[PDB]
Design a protein around this ligand. Structure first.
Ligand SMILES: [Cl-]
Length: 129
């Protein structure tokens, strides 16, 4: 599934992500946009064998379990196969798990190099939320 911008914004606000640990909805919208462009199926396998999964590109080394990473922690307790669902609930719960660690949304490098420090509202702008 390739979410619409505010289809995903509404799905994230109905998931309680608005201002979760200090990060307004614009942060999450923009982070998803620049991690996978609103794609739940997206996947990226990086030379160490770990793999970024889902709409938030959660890595398969700390957070999920795919059974083919030699690391390999499963801190969200989840098969990455559930992070590739149409429903974003698994990814949202694991992301609340991650963002509550003290690194914050700096755990997602795309949000850090494109979103962090911007007027992120413009992502939930015109949303009809
Ligand atoms: Cl980038």
């Amino acid at each position: 599934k390739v979410f619409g911008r505010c289809e995903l914004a509404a799905a994230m606000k109905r998931h309680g992500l608005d201002n979760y640990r200090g990060y307004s909805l614009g942060n999450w919208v923009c982070a998803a946009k620049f991690e996978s462009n609103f794609n739940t199926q997206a996947t990226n396998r990086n030379t160490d064998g770990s793999t970024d999964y889902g709409i938030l590109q959660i890595n398969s080394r700390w957070w999920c379990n795919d059974g083919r990473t030699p690391g390999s922690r499963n801190l969200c307790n989840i098969p990455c196969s559930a992070l590739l669902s149409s429903d974003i609930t698994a990814s949202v719960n694991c992301a609340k798990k991650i963002v509550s660690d003290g690194n914050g949304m700096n755990a997602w490098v795309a949000w850090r190099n494109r979103c962090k420090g911007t007027d992120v509202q413009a992502w939930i702008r015109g949303c009809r939320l």
